[PDB]
mmCIF file of C-alpha atoms in Angstrom:
data_model
loop_
_atom_site.group_PDB
_atom_site.id
_atom_site.type_symbol
_atom_site.label_atom_id
_atom_site.label_comp_id
_atom_site.label_asym_id
_atom_site.label_seq_id
_atom_site.Cartn_x
_atom_site.Cartn_y
_atom_site.Cartn_z
ATOM 1 C CA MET X 5 115.470 166.058 82.197
ATOM 2 C CA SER X 6 113.549 162.610 81.620
ATOM 3 C CA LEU X 7 110.924 162.578 79.144
ATOM 4 C CA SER X 8 108.164 159.647 80.276
ATOM 5 C CA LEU X 9 105.722 161.121 77.930
ATOM 6 C CA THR X 10 108.089 159.979 74.760
ATOM 7 C CA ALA X 11 107.291 156.089 76.187
ATOM 8 C CA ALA X 12 103.692 156.861 76.070
ATOM 9 C CA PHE X 13 104.138 158.327 73.069
ATOM 10 C CA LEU X 14 105.508 155.200 70.956
ATOM 11 C CA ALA X 15 103.006 153.404 72.938
ATOM 12 C CA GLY X 16 100.475 155.277 72.143
ATOM 13 C CA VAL X 17 101.048 154.842 68.107
ATOM 14 C CA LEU X 18 102.124 150.532 68.933
ATOM 15 C CA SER X 19 98.414 150.772 70.409
ATOM 16 C CA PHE X 20 96.618 152.680 66.950
ATOM 17 C CA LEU X 21 98.814 150.090 64.937
ATOM 18 C CA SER X 22 98.074 147.142 67.417
ATOM 19 C CA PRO X 23 94.976 144.688 65.888
ATOM 20 C CA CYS X 24 93.890 144.169 69.558
ATOM 21 C CA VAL X 25 92.788 147.907 70.104
ATOM 22 C CA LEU X 26 92.552 149.964 66.982
ATOM 23 C CA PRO X 27 90.620 152.994 67.894
ATOM 24 C CA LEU X 28 89.095 153.276 64.545
ATOM 25 C CA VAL X 29 86.784 150.344 65.476
ATOM 26 C CA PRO X 30 84.874 151.804 68.268
ATOM 27 C CA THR X 31 85.104 155.058 66.748
ATOM 28 C CA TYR X 32 83.272 153.588 62.994
ATOM 29 C CA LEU X 33 80.943 152.338 65.791
ATOM 30 C CA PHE X 34 80.510 155.053 67.973
ATOM 31 C CA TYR X 35 79.493 157.327 65.083
ATOM 32 C CA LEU X 36 77.323 154.121 63.854
ATOM 33 C CA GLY X 37 75.096 155.429 67.057
ATOM 34 C CA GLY X 38 74.949 158.721 65.686
ATOM 35 C CA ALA X 39 75.040 159.979 69.338
ATOM 36 C CA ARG X 40 75.254 163.702 69.187
ATOM 37 C CA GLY X 41 77.802 164.415 67.083
ATOM 38 C CA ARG X 42 80.508 166.159 69.155
ATOM 39 C CA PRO X 43 83.876 164.833 69.486
ATOM 40 C CA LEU X 44 85.288 166.772 72.145
ATOM 41 C CA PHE X 45 83.075 166.090 74.748
ATOM 42 C CA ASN X 46 83.169 162.237 73.922
ATOM 43 C CA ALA X 47 86.779 162.702 73.589
ATOM 44 C CA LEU X 48 86.469 164.559 77.151
ATOM 45 C CA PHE X 49 84.045 161.809 78.691
ATOM 46 C CA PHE X 50 86.205 158.748 77.762
ATOM 47 C CA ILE X 51 89.454 159.994 79.346
ATOM 48 C CA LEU X 52 87.942 161.362 82.332
ATOM 49 C CA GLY X 53 85.709 157.957 82.406
ATOM 50 C CA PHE X 54 89.521 155.936 81.516
ATOM 51 C CA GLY X 55 91.501 157.508 84.166
ATOM 52 C CA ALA X 56 88.902 157.151 87.116
ATOM 53 C CA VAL X 57 89.162 153.723 86.532
ATOM 54 C CA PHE X 58 93.022 153.403 85.597
ATOM 55 C CA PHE X 59 93.073 155.153 88.934
ATOM 56 C CA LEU X 60 90.264 153.590 91.360
ATOM 57 C CA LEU X 61 91.551 149.932 89.967
ATOM 58 C CA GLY X 62 95.204 150.916 89.543
ATOM 59 C CA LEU X 63 95.237 151.742 93.851
ATOM 60 C CA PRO X 64 94.499 147.862 94.607
ATOM 61 C CA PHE X 65 96.861 146.960 92.056
ATOM 62 C CA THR X 66 99.688 147.593 94.743
ATOM 63 C CA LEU X 67 98.565 144.761 96.974
ATOM 64 C CA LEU X 68 97.264 142.950 93.770
ATOM 65 C CA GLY X 69 100.374 142.267 93.584
ATOM 66 C CA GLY X 70 100.648 139.603 95.816
ATOM 67 C CA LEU X 71 98.388 137.226 93.989
ATOM 68 C CA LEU X 72 100.617 137.188 90.904
ATOM 69 C CA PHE X 73 102.008 134.407 93.133
ATOM 70 C CA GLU X 74 99.198 132.102 92.063
ATOM 71 C CA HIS X 75 97.739 131.415 89.106
ATOM 72 C CA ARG X 76 94.476 133.265 87.457
ATOM 73 C CA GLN X 77 94.952 132.144 83.793
ATOM 74 C CA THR X 78 91.098 131.603 84.187
ATOM 75 C CA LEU X 79 90.702 135.332 83.992
ATOM 76 C CA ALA X 80 92.213 134.756 80.107
ATOM 77 C CA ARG X 81 89.453 132.649 79.450
ATOM 78 C CA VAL X 82 86.666 134.859 80.065
ATOM 79 C CA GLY X 83 87.891 137.110 77.957
ATOM 80 C CA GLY X 84 87.165 134.375 74.744
ATOM 81 C CA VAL X 85 83.929 134.135 75.685
ATOM 82 C CA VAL X 86 82.848 137.740 75.544
ATOM 83 C CA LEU X 87 84.430 137.533 71.784
ATOM 84 C CA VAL X 88 82.702 134.834 71.198
ATOM 85 C CA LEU X 89 79.340 135.743 71.794
ATOM 86 C CA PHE X 90 80.204 139.584 70.672
ATOM 87 C CA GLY X 91 81.138 137.891 67.189
ATOM 88 C CA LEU X 92 78.079 136.002 67.170
ATOM 89 C CA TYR X 93 76.004 139.352 67.590
ATOM 90 C CA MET X 94 78.411 141.029 64.494
ATOM 91 C CA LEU X 95 77.135 138.622 62.393
ATOM 92 C CA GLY X 96 73.946 140.044 62.562
ATOM 93 C CA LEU X 97 72.222 137.095 64.321
ATOM 94 C CA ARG X 98 69.962 136.875 67.192
ATOM 95 C CA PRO X 99 69.864 134.097 69.806
ATOM 96 C CA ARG X 100 65.935 134.374 70.429
ATOM 97 C CA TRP X 101 64.580 133.002 66.970
ATOM 98 C CA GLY X 102 61.224 134.806 67.442
ATOM 99 C CA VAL X 103 61.255 138.803 66.890
ATOM 100 C CA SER X 104 57.418 140.243 67.832
ATOM 101 C CA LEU X 105 56.350 143.381 66.137
ATOM 102 C CA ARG X 106 55.078 146.882 67.512
ATOM 103 C CA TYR X 107 58.100 147.089 69.905
ATOM 104 C CA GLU X 108 59.358 149.793 72.081
ATOM 105 C CA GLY X 109 62.766 151.704 71.639
ATOM 106 C CA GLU X 110 62.469 155.540 70.732
ATOM 107 C CA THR X 111 66.505 156.752 72.192
ATOM 108 C CA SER X 112 67.709 153.604 71.103
ATOM 109 C CA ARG X 113 70.405 155.802 69.464
ATOM 110 C CA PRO X 114 72.373 156.345 72.589
ATOM 111 C CA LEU X 115 72.052 152.814 73.667
ATOM 112 C CA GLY X 116 74.991 151.435 71.143
ATOM 113 C CA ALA X 117 76.941 154.351 72.389
ATOM 114 C CA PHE X 118 77.116 153.980 76.126
ATOM 115 C CA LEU X 119 77.117 149.705 75.711
ATOM 116 C CA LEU X 120 79.983 150.758 73.242
ATOM 117 C CA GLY X 121 81.538 152.611 75.926
ATOM 118 C CA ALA X 122 80.694 149.681 78.730
ATOM 119 C CA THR X 123 81.751 147.060 76.219
ATOM 120 C CA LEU X 124 85.597 148.409 76.066
ATOM 121 C CA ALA X 125 86.108 148.214 80.017
ATOM 122 C CA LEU X 126 84.142 144.766 81.245
ATOM 123 C CA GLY X 127 85.948 143.908 77.357
ATOM 124 C CA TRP X 128 89.635 142.518 78.216
ATOM 125 C CA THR X 129 92.227 142.686 75.753
ATOM 126 C CA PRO X 130 93.836 139.258 76.528
ATOM 127 C CA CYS X 131 97.258 140.748 74.264
ATOM 128 C CA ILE X 132 97.310 143.481 76.461
ATOM 129 C CA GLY X 133 97.317 141.516 79.900
ATOM 130 C CA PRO X 134 100.812 140.332 79.906
ATOM 131 C CA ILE X 135 102.044 143.924 79.349
ATOM 132 C CA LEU X 136 99.789 145.745 81.588
ATOM 133 C CA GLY X 137 100.722 142.832 84.639
ATOM 134 C CA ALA X 138 104.375 143.774 83.641
ATOM 135 C CA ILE X 139 103.511 147.354 85.011
ATOM 136 C CA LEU X 140 102.088 146.092 88.002
ATOM 137 C CA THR X 141 105.421 144.571 89.332
ATOM 138 C CA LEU X 142 106.851 148.211 88.881
ATOM 139 C CA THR X 143 104.304 150.000 90.792
ATOM 140 C CA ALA X 144 104.893 147.643 93.211
ATOM 141 C CA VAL X 145 107.784 148.564 93.940
ATOM 142 C CA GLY X 146 107.541 152.235 93.325
ATOM 143 C CA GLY X 147 104.510 153.747 91.116
ATOM 144 C CA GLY X 148 103.925 155.600 88.026
ATOM 145 C CA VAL X 149 101.792 158.722 88.702
ATOM 146 C CA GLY X 150 103.085 160.766 85.883
ATOM 147 C CA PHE X 151 103.359 157.700 83.841
ATOM 148 C CA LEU X 152 99.213 157.047 84.040
ATOM 149 C CA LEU X 153 98.773 160.751 82.774
ATOM 150 C CA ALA X 154 101.632 160.880 80.106
ATOM 151 C CA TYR X 155 99.776 157.467 78.759
ATOM 152 C CA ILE X 156 96.588 159.145 78.716
ATOM 153 C CA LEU X 157 97.684 162.523 77.504
ATOM 154 C CA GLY X 158 99.720 160.405 74.969
ATOM 155 C CA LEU X 159 96.617 159.006 73.699
ATOM 156 C CA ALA X 160 94.678 162.476 73.967
ATOM 157 C CA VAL X 161 97.151 164.051 71.215
ATOM 158 C CA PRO X 162 96.434 161.816 68.069
ATOM 159 C CA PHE X 163 92.465 161.875 69.483
ATOM 160 C CA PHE X 164 92.272 165.713 69.577
ATOM 161 C CA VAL X 165 94.211 165.527 66.243
ATOM 162 C CA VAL X 166 91.519 163.446 64.506
ATOM 163 C CA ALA X 167 88.516 164.919 66.336
ATOM 164 C CA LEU X 168 89.855 168.154 64.373
ATOM 165 C CA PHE X 169 90.095 166.697 61.023
ATOM 166 C CA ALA X 170 87.187 164.860 61.152
ATOM 167 C CA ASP X 171 85.481 167.864 60.594
ATOM 168 C CA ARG X 172 86.145 167.874 57.077
ATOM 169 C CA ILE X 173 86.152 164.127 56.599
ATOM 170 C CA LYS X 174 82.988 164.094 58.361
ATOM 171 C CA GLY X 175 81.799 165.776 54.670
ATOM 172 C CA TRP X 176 83.666 162.973 52.714
ATOM 173 C CA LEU X 177 81.990 160.154 55.071
ATOM 174 C CA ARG X 178 78.308 160.969 53.165
ATOM 175 C CA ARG X 179 79.896 161.603 49.964
ATOM 176 C CA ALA X 180 82.103 158.268 49.395
ATOM 177 C CA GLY X 181 79.091 156.297 48.960
ATOM 178 C CA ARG X 182 78.816 152.225 50.133
ATOM 179 C CA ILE X 183 82.675 152.365 50.572
ATOM 180 C CA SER X 184 82.492 153.194 53.858
ATOM 181 C CA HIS X 185 80.298 150.082 53.997
ATOM 182 C CA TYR X 186 82.412 147.627 53.093
ATOM 183 C CA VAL X 187 85.683 148.391 55.417
ATOM 184 C CA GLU X 188 82.587 148.649 58.254
ATOM 185 C CA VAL X 189 82.289 144.686 58.229
ATOM 186 C CA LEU X 190 85.803 144.015 56.755
ATOM 187 C CA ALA X 191 87.534 145.114 60.301
ATOM 188 C CA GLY X 192 85.279 143.788 61.962
ATOM 189 C CA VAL X 193 85.829 140.006 60.552
ATOM 190 C CA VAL X 194 89.857 140.484 61.162
ATOM 191 C CA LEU X 195 88.576 141.322 64.448
ATOM 192 C CA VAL X 196 86.802 138.218 65.075
ATOM 193 C CA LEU X 197 89.477 136.123 63.085
ATOM 194 C CA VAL X 198 92.254 137.767 65.503
ATOM 195 C CA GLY X 199 90.376 136.980 68.903
ATOM 196 C CA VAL X 200 89.581 133.385 67.595
ATOM 197 C CA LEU X 201 93.223 132.833 66.828
ATOM 198 C CA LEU X 202 94.519 134.328 70.328
ATOM 199 C CA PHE X 203 92.100 132.091 71.986
ATOM 200 C CA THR X 204 93.024 128.995 70.272
ATOM 201 C CA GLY X 205 96.533 129.877 69.396
ATOM 202 C CA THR X 206 97.664 130.864 73.211
ATOM 203 C CA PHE X 207 101.086 130.949 73.306
ATOM 204 C CA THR X 208 102.462 130.001 70.145
ATOM 205 C CA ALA X 209 103.564 131.671 66.626
ATOM 206 C CA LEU X 210 100.561 133.568 66.778
ATOM 207 C CA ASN X 211 102.238 135.497 70.012
ATOM 208 C CA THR X 212 104.914 136.416 67.499
ATOM 209 C CA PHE X 213 102.981 137.537 64.898
ATOM 210 C CA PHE X 214 102.776 140.521 66.804
ATOM 211 C CA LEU X 215 105.547 141.214 65.409
ATOM 212 C CA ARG X 216 104.901 141.255 62.137
ATOM 213 C CA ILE X 217 102.234 144.260 62.164
ATOM 214 C CA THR X 218 104.899 146.406 64.325
ATOM 215 C CA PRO X 219 106.910 148.350 61.364
ATOM 216 C CA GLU X 220 110.171 147.830 61.179
ATOM 217 C CA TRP X 221 110.750 152.000 60.802
ATOM 218 C CA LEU X 222 110.288 152.520 64.262
ATOM 219 C CA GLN X 223 112.462 150.039 65.438
ATOM 220 C CA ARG X 224 114.942 151.177 63.695
ATOM 221 C CA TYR X 225 114.335 154.900 64.788
ATOM 222 C CA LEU X 226 115.770 153.861 68.357
ATOM 223 C CA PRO X 227 118.835 155.600 69.480
ATOM 224 C CA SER X 228 119.271 152.819 71.957
#
């Protein structure tokens, strides 16, 4: 009689409107790498990959709850370093000011796709850290196998809808013009701004600013 999918559904929508996630960002880079052009296979692959990691890493989370009694805030610092490094590369600047010519590459297109995948796996979002950490305390006293599946399925729904709608939008992307290039760098700038404001902001008004992005029309739609 209880539907855990409801929570996962609302959570999925929150992640979509969350400036710390924004699936449209990685997708814009994935499509920028060319890849193959198969959203169904790309989604299924990401779903399986993410699910496998969430399960394999979810297992030790039972014993990892005992480590929470100590302190591992130093793990949040690593995320900031990665964000800074990514921001520097996003600026289009190279660390080695001595690039030669007549280099090799060939299949450099799938490299951006594979790298972006590993990026989302290694690049942990500190904004979702406390939120995920709160789930460990719940899985330590019980668990939530169906909950994990509901979370993945919840994100699968919008992904499938977007994948199908992207078919008609694909013809528009090439018809638009140079406008698609404006939003390309725009999202990147905001991403770096939020990332740097979170690292240097820490526990401040920045944590409360996340409530300014959350639509009040969704909060007023709660029966409880």
